[PDB]
């Protein structure tokens, strides 16, 4: 099966800082990845729909990158309203997968 | 012994009809050509069944005249070649028009999406009209660019020349012109042997049907190549077959001429 | 937008159906319609998806045998749960997996979610 | 040798091919179908002009099925039809515009070949004399 693991299960960064979230695939998903931001008590909000292609209404602050199995999410100017949880979902493999979402990373504002 | 002649004519008609229907079924029903006919309508079958009938008739054409009734059968075979070539040419004109309209953004979205294949290194194209040129200039460019188009135009022109110069009046009263211009059959057969060298009309590869499932991936056209269940399909065309049918009669006629 | 109907306290081992009715979105394009659940304080769990056109339905390995996702109508999709256990208590989201122009997918539209309790 | 006898049949075949290609273009709604419609018209005109065969200078000729009516009609046009330079030029000019559409390019080529054969015949001094 294809399992995604988000190594930084909890990351803290001060305002105007940078946060790096890495979501590595157990199998080569052909850049079909999506990054969601889920504020508490709120449905997740899509940020990147391709590997690094911004979604509508999402600033250039949220950068996706990586290819093959290793992917990254970056926040240039982390604000005080970004204290949420970020998930990564692979749409490449849906036949035999326990969970499409790669665990979850909680971002804290310092 | 008119019974033998009637039997031969009836057998010829039966074989032609059987070949036409059989190859229409071959190029219409099976899912190998699912995307090909999704792009070309029934013009695929209507162009590839007269191809089989033409292989048969082009095999038959030279046998009657190889001396070492028969000329009547030769004329009937020539006219059957003319008919099947007309159907073939019309079907392929439709194919060229639709393919060119799909290559540019002037066709239905699914056909256009199919036409995008082959733009990358590791893709096999289905739409043999690669250059993004509008119509009618696009079809004309295909005619003089593709090996199939050039050879088809040349052999068709020589076919009309042979038919129009083999009329009864020219043949009885101007046998010199008839005989001198009848040797366009050399150009006809030379062009016909290499006609299908490029293999531009392509159906989905034999192995690609295993990784790529038609009923699971028909409506996922946009997601091909980035979801596991729908790897981007690979297409391949048939090898040239008409040379197999035509080589026999050419060799026999060449031997006959050497005897002469 | 999307909204999930259903969702109520249920005795263990019973069955429940969540109905996801859209308002302004039609489930007839080429996009999927996935169901995602999130247990209280846990990460998102993917249940399954249902292509709008083909009708092919996918489920997570744990949900293959007892979760049924069907597009009942052009605007309503239903998830049926059977043999529910205490471990199935979670907030169930109905999300539309929008297949963007490039071919890459993303859960563009999300439903508010309906609490489901099994006990 | 009488090249007009072959030119007549070549032009008739070109007319049939032009009609077929134009029918395909219009019925199939090909891009710029109006060229297909003009090809239909030109092929019909060429068939009407060429159906009546001429007369051999030496020996007899064989009539075309129902050729009397069309040859009588053509007779009424005077030297515009008897002359073969005019016929060759007319065929070339009718073939040119039909060559902008793929379906009719074959017809255009066949008509151009027919015009060339007519020019060759006219150089020899031949002309279309109606058969009575
Ligand atoms: C038919 C095929 O269209 C054709 O292929 C017409 C071929 C007619 C052939 C010659 C017969 C007359 C011969 C005279 C001898 C003298 C069109 O319908 P379709 O196939 O369903 O195509 C739909 C549009 N699509 C192609 C985009 C899907
Ligand atoms: C008859 C008339 O003989 C003719 O006038 C010949 C006219 C039809 C010719 C072949 C065209 C089809 C081949 C091209 C196919 C591709 C067409 C593609 C169309 C787009 C002769 O009979 P007789 O000998 O005088 O007795
Ligand atoms: C369509 C493709 C055709 C091919 C490939 C072809 C080929 C040939 C060949 C090779 C010969 C023998 C030449 C020789 O013996 O030196 C021949 C003979 C003949 N063909 Fe055809 N031909 C074709 C079409 C036609 C047509 C359309 C007609 C009539 C409408 C026709 C009528 C004849 C006749 C009458 C002969 C006898 C020649 C003779 O007796 O010398 N052919 N053909
Ligand atoms: C403008 C006219 C024509 C066009 C555009 C045309 C086009 C084509 C094309 C694209 C193919 C497929 C080749 C391949 O897939 O490799 C083909 C095959 C074929 N055509 Fe035509 N053609 C024309 C005229 C003719 C004529 C006059 C004949 C007379 C016999 C003919 C006989 C055949 C045969 C036998 C094949 C099969 C080739 C093979 O299987 O190797 N075609 N044609
Ligand atoms: C192609 O044409 C369609 C309209 O027929 C249009 O919606 C689309 O944006 C155009 N471009 C592409 C790449 O499809
Ligand atoms: C194409 O495939 C070959 C081997 O299958 C691979 O080495 C190459 O990187 C591929 N290139 C692209 C652009 O996919
Ligand atoms: C494609 O998938 C289906 C069901 O999704 C199956 O019935 C069919 O046999 C598959 N195709 C092949 C060639 O096995």
Numbering used by the authors:
A (entry chain E): 1 to 110
B (entry chain A): 7 to 74, 96 to 287
C (entry chain D): 2 to 120
D (entry chain B): 4 to 135
Give the published text:
NOX2 is the prototypical member of the NADPH oxidase NOX superfamily and produces superoxide (O2•−), a key reactive oxygen species (ROS) that is essential in innate and adaptive immunity. NOX2, the most-studied member, is expressed primarily in phagocytic cells such as neutrophils and macrophages and is responsible for superoxide production during the respiratory burst, a process where ROS are rapidly generated in phagosomes to destroy microbial pathogens. The core of NOX2 is formed by a heterodimeric transmembrane complex composed of NOX2 (formerly gp91) and p22, but a detailed description of its structural architecture is lacking. In the activated complex, electrons are first transferred from NADPH to flavin adenine dinucleotide (FAD) bound within the intracellular domain of NOX2 and subsequently transferred via two heme molecules in the transmembrane domain of NOX2 to molecular oxygen, producing superoxide through an outer-sphere reaction.
Here, we have resolved the structure of the inactive heterodimeric NOX2–p22 core complex bound to the selective anti-NOX2-Fab 7G5. Addition of Fab 7G5 to the NOX2 core complex purified in mild detergent significantly improved particle alignment and facilitated structure determination by cryogenic electron microscopy (cryo-EM). A three-dimensional reconstruction of the NOX2 core-7G5 Fab tripartite complex was obtained at 3.2 Å resolution. The overall NOX2 core-7G5 Fab complex resembles a vase and flower assembly, where NOX2–p22 form a composite transmembrane base while the 7G5 Fab attaches to the most membrane-distal portion of extracellular loop 3 (ECL3; or classically, extracellular loop E) on NOX2. In NOX2, the heme-binding ferric oxidoreductase transmembrane domain (TMD) and all three extracellular loops (ECLs): ECL1 (loop A), ECL2 (loop C), ECL3 (loop E) are well-resolved, whereas the intracellular FAD and NADPH-binding dehydrogenase domain (DHD) is only visualized at lower cryo-EM map contours. The TMD architecture of NOX2 closely resembles the catalytic subunits of Cylindrospermum stagnale NOX5 (csNOX5, rmsd = 1.1 Å), mouse DUOX1 (rmsd = 0.97 Å), and human DUOX1 (rmsd = 0.95 Å)32–34, with TMs 2–5 adopting a similar hourglass-shaped scaffold that sandwiches two heme groups orthogonal to the membrane plane. A striking feature of the NOX2 core complex structure is that the ECLs of NOX2 fold into an organization that caps the outer heme. We observe that the p22 subunit of NOX2 adopts a four-helix transmembrane fold (TM1–TM4) with two short extracellular loops connecting TM1–TM2 and TM3–TM4. NOX2 and p22 assemble through an extensive, electrostatic and shape-complementary interface (∼7400 Å2), consistent with the obligate heterodimeric nature of the NOX2 core complex. Notably, several elongated densities assigned as membrane lipids are observed across the NOX2–p22 interface that also appear to stabilize the NOX2 core complex.
